[PDB]
Design a protein around this ligand. Structure first.
Ligand SMILES: *[C@@H]1O[C@H](CO)[C@@H](O[C@@H]2O[C@H](CO)[C@@H](O)[C@H](O)[C@H]2NC(C)=O)[C@H](O)[C@H]1NC(C)=O
Ligand SMILES: *[C@@H]1O[C@H](CO)[C@@H](O[C@@H]2O[C@H](CO)[C@@H](O)[C@H](O)[C@H]2NC(C)=O)[C@H](O)[C@H]1NC(C)=O
Ligand SMILES: *[C@@H]1O[C@H](CO)[C@@H](O[C@@H]2O[C@H](CO)[C@@H](O)[C@H](O)[C@H]2NC(C)=O)[C@H](O)[C@H]1NC(C)=O
Ligand SMILES: *[C@@H]1O[C@H](CO)[C@@H](O[C@@H]2O[C@H](CO)[C@@H](O)[C@H](O)[C@H]2NC(C)=O)[C@H](O)[C@H]1NC(C)=O
Ligand SMILES: *[C@@H]1O[C@H](CO)[C@@H](O[C@@H]2O[C@H](CO)[C@@H](O)[C@H](O)[C@H]2NC(C)=O)[C@H](O)[C@H]1NC(C)=O
Ligand SMILES: *[C@@H]1O[C@H](CO)[C@@H](O[C@@H]2O[C@H](CO)[C@@H](O)[C@H](O)[C@H]2NC(C)=O)[C@H](O)[C@H]1NC(C)=O
Ligand SMILES: *[C@@H]1O[C@H](CO)[C@@H](O)[C@H](O)[C@H]1NC(C)=O
Ligand SMILES: *[C@@H]1O[C@H](CO)[C@@H](O)[C@H](O)[C@H]1NC(C)=O
Ligand SMILES: *[C@@H]1O[C@H](CO)[C@@H](O)[C@H](O)[C@H]1NC(C)=O
Ligand SMILES: *[C@@H]1O[C@H](CO)[C@@H](O)[C@H](O)[C@H]1NC(C)=O
Lengths: 168, 212, 116, 49
C-alpha cells in the first residue's frame, strides 16, 4: 500500500502526498500485474493434462519399479518419496503476501496424473485420447526412436530394469 | 468453416498491448496538471504572481516532478518492449518451423500431430492456423512382443502384433489395418526362450507355396 | 492491528447486480447471511457448496466463485475430469479413425512507436 | 511438453545421452525433471569400408 508505506497513519502526510498525482496508482498496478503473472506461470507448467489419470492397483511394469516417485497414500499431502525430500530442503507497514491460487496439494495431484499418463500410455495421452500399451513394449518403441533395434531391449529386459532401479 | 464462425461471433492478447500503451500515455499527460508542491500547475501563473527570484524556486519543483514522471514512462516502456521482443522471436520461430516445415516437437504447432500451418496477419501480430491429425475411436486387442515359430523369435519390422481373439496380425501403430504375419513384415533374432511374453503362431513364407 | 485489501466479486453488470466481497487475510470476526472463512480472507455474500466445478472467478488457495443460473458461491476448483486407463500386461488400444482439427494461435509482434 | 509428453531428438534438451523418457516432480516454487537417457559403453575398434 503506497500510501501506508509513505505517510503511515499521519494525516499531514496524506494531503501532501495527494499533490504528486498518480504515482501510487501506477505502482499498485505494476505490482498487481506481477502477482497475476505468477499464477499463469504455474498453470502453464502444470495444468497440461485433460483428465486426472490413475495408476492401476497392481504394479506389473516389466520389472521396472516406480515406487519412489508415485504418490504416497499414507499422507495428508499425498506427495511421493522424492517430493517429500525436496520439500524439506527449500504483518508490516502496508506489506502483504497473497496466497497462490493452486495449493501444492493440487500441484502434486497434477504431477502424479502426468506420471500415470506416461507409465500407462506412453505418449498417446499428450496428443489425443490415452491408449494403454504394456510398459516393456513402450520401452521398445523408445529404443527404436534412438536408433537401436528393439530386440536389444527384449533380450536385456532384466538388466535394463535393474540399471533403471539402481539409478533411481 | 468453424474458425470463421467462432471469430465472427478472442484477440485479448492483442487488445492488452494496445490498452497498456494507451493507459501509460494517458497517465503521462495527466501528470501535467499536478503541483508537486508548488502554487499552481501553470508556468504562466508562476510567471505572473511571483518575481523572478521567487519563481525559480517554484519552477524547479515542477521541473523535478515532470522529469521524474517522464523517466518513469521511459523505464516501463523498456520493460514492456523487452517482452514484446520475446513474443516476436517466438513468432519468427513458429513461422520457420510450422509454416515452412513439419514439426515433430510436441505441442509446438498445435495439439495433436502436426500436419501443416497457415499464417494470417493481425493488427499488431500474427495468427497461426494449425492443422493437426487426431486419432479416434480406439479398440482394445491383446498383444505380444514377439512370435515363436520353428524355434525362432520374430519381431515386427514396423508395427505391432495384435490378436482379435483367435488370430494374429500386424498393424501399424496409429491406424488399425491388420495384415497376415509373413517373413516380409517381420525379422528374426534368437531363439524363443529369452523374450518374456512370446506367443506361438505360424509365420507364413510366401515363396514356399508359390514356388511349389 | 488488522489491515487488508477489499475485493469485489461480480458476475458482470450484464448478468446481475449482486456482489460478493473479500476482505483479504482478515479474520472474519473483525470485519465490521453468508460469512465464509478462506485461507485468502473472509468472504461475504457467497454461499459455500460441496460440489466442485471448473474454476470461474479465482479467489485463491484453491477456492473459486461463480454465479450459476441463483447467487454467487464458493468452492474448490476442479483439476479436471477423471480418466481411468485399463492398463494390463498384454493389452493394447489402437485407433480406427481420425479427425482433422485446426486451431488458432495469436501472437503480438509489435507495439506503437512513440516519440517525446 | 517435449520431454515428458514425448520423446525428443534435440541434443541435450533432456539430459546427456539419447533421451528415453522423463518424469516430473513438484518442488517448492519449481519443478524437477528426472531424465532417463541411454549412454553407449564398452566400445571396440574395427576395420570398415
Ligand atoms: C521398489 O524399490 C523399493 C526400494 O526403494 C523397494 O522397497 C524396499 O525394499 C527393500 C527390500 O527389497 C526393503 O528392505 C526396504 O525396506 C523397502 N523400502 C521401502 C518399503 O520403503 C520396493 O520393494 C520395490 N518394489 C518392488 C515391487 O519390489
Ligand atoms: C478396453 O477393455 C477394458 C477392460 O474391460 C475396458 O475398460 C473397462 O470398461 C468398463 C466399461 O466401460 C468399466 O466399467 C471398467 O471400469 C473398465 N476398466 C477395467 C475393467 O479395468 C475398456 O472400455 C476397453 N476399451 C475400449 C476402447 O473398448
Ligand atoms: C478374427 O478375424 C478373422 C479374420 O481373418 C475371423 O476369421 C474369419 O472370419 C470370416 C467371417 O466370420 C470367415 O469367413 C473366415 O472363414 C474366418 N477365418 C479366416 C481364416 O478368414 C475371426 O472370426 C475373427 N475373430 C473374432 C473373434 O472376431
Ligand atoms: C510353444 O510351442 C513349443 C513347441 O511346439 C512348446 O514346447 C513344448 O511344450 C510342451 C508342453 O510344455 C513340452 O512337452 C514339449 O517338450 C515342448 N517342446 C519344445 C521343443 O520345447 C511350448 O510349450 C509352446 N508354448 C505354449 C505356451 O504352448
Ligand atoms: C470415421 O469417422 C467419420 C466421421 O468423422 C465417419 O463418417 C461419418 O459417417 C456418418 C455415418 O455414416 C455420417 O453421418 C457422416 O456424414 C460422416 N462424416 C463425414 C465427415 O463424412 C466414418 O464412417 C468413420 N469411419 C469408420 C470406419 O468408422
Ligand atoms: C582402438 O585402437 C586405438 C589405436 O589405433 C587405441 O588408441 C591407442 O590407445 C592406447 C591406449 O589408450 C594408447 O596408448 C595409444 O597411443 C593409442 N594409439 C594412438 C595411435 O594414439 C584405442 O584405445 C582402441 N580402442 C578400443 C576400444 O580398442
Ligand atoms: C502377466 O501377468 C500374469 C498375471 O495375471 C502372469 O500370469 C503372466 O505370466 C504375465 N505375463 C507377462 C508377459 O508379464
Ligand atoms: C450482454 O448484453 C447483451 C444485450 O443486453 C446480451 O446479448 C449478451 O448476451 C450479454 N452478455 C452476457 C455475457 O450476458
Ligand atoms: C479468528 O479468531 C478466532 C478467535 O480467536 C479463532 O478461533 C479463529 O481461528 C481465527 N481465525 C482463523 C482463520 O484462525
Ligand atoms: C459437505 O460435506 C461434509 C462432509 O464431511 C458435511 O459435513 C457438510 O455438512 C457438507 N456441507 C454442506 C453445505 O452440506
Amino acid at each position: 500500500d503506497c500510501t501506508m508505506y509513505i505517510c503511515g497513519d499521519s494525516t499531514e502526510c496524506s494531503n501532501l502526498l495527494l499533490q504528486y498525482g498518480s504515482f501510487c496508482t501506477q505502482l499498485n498496478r505494476a505490482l498487481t500485474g506481477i502477482a497475476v503473472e505468477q499464477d499463469k506461470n504455474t498453470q502453464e507448467v502444470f495444468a497440461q493434462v485433460k483428465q486426472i489419470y490413475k495408476t492401476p492397483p497392481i504394479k506389473d511394469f516389466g520389472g521396472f519399479n516406480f515406487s519412489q516417485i508415485l504418490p504416497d497414500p499414507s499422507k495428508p499431502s499425498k506427495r511421493s518419496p522424492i517430493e517429500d525430500l525436496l520439500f524439506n530442503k527449500v504483518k508490516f507497514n502496508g506489506l502483504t503476501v497473497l496466497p497462490p491460487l493452486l495449493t501444492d496439494e493440487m500441484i502434486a495431484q497434477y504431477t502424479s496424473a502426468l506420471l500415470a499418463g506416461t507409465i500407462t500410455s506412453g505418449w498417446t495421452f499428450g496428443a489425443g485420447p490415452a491408449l494403454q500399451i504394456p510398459f516393456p513394449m513402450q520401452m521398445a518403441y523408445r529404443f527404436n526412436g534412438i536408433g537401436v533395434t528393439q530386440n536389444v531391449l527384449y533380450e536385456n529386459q532384466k538388466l535394463i530394469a535393474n540399471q533403471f532401479n539402481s539409478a533411481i | 468453416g468453424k474458425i470463421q464462425d467462432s471469430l465472427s461471433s478472442a484477440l485479448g492478447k492483442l487488445q492488452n498491448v494496445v490498452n497498456q500503451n494507451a493507459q501509460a500515455l494517458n497517465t503521462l499527460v495527466k501528470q501535467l496538471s499536478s503541483n508537486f508542491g508548488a502554487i499552481s500547475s501553470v508556468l504562466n501563473d508562476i510567471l505572473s504572481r511571483l518575481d523572478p527570484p521567487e519563481a525559480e524556486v517554484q519552477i524547479d519543483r515542477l521541473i523535478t516532478g515532470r522529469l521524474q514522471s517522464l523517466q518513469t514512462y521511459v523505464t516501463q516502456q523498456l520493460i514492456r518492449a523487452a517482452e514484446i521482443r520475446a513474443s516476436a522471436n517466438l513468432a519468427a520461430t513458429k513461422m520457420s518451423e510450422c509454416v515452412l516445415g513439419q514439426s515433430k516437437r510436441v505441442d509446438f504447432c498445435g495439439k495433436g500431430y502436426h500436419l501443416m500451418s497457415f499464417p494470417q496477419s493481425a493488427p499488431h501480430g500474427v495468427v497461426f492456423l494449425h492443422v493437426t491429425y487426431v486419432p479416434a475411436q480406439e479398440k482394445n486387442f491383446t498383444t505380444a512382443p514377439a512370435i515363436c515359430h520353428d524355434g525362432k523369435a520374430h519381431f515386427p519390422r514396423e508395427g505391432v502384433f495384435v490378436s482379435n481373439g483367435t488370430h494374429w496380425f500386424v498393424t501399424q501403430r496409429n491406424f488399425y489395418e491388420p495384415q497376415i504375419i509373413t517373413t516380409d513384415n517381420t525379422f528374426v533374432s534368437g531363439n524363443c526362450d529369452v523374450v518374456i511374453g512370446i506367443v506361438n503362431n505360424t509365420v507364413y513364407d510366401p515363396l514356399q507355396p508359390e514356388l511349389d | 492491528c488488522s489491515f487488508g485489501g477489499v475485493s469485489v466479486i461480480t458476475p458482470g453488470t450484464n448478468t446481475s447486480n449482486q456482489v460478493a466481497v473479500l476482505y483479504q487475510g482478515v479474520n472474519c470476526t473483525e470485519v465490521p447471511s453468508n460469512v465464509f472463512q478462506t485461507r485468502a480472507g473472509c468472504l461475504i455474500g457467497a454461499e459455500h457448496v460441496n460440489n466442485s466445478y471448473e474454476c470461474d472467478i479465482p479467489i485463491g488457495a484453491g477456492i473459486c466463485a461463480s454465479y450459476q443460473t441463483q447467487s454467487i458461491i464458493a468452492y474448490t476448483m476442479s483439476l479436471g475430469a477423471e480418466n481411468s486407463v485399463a492398463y494390463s500386461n498384454n493389452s493394447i488400444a489402437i485407433p480406427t479413425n481420425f479427425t482433422i482439427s485446426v486451431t488458432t494461435e495469436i501472437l503480438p509482434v509489435s507495439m506503437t512507436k512513440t516519440s517525446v
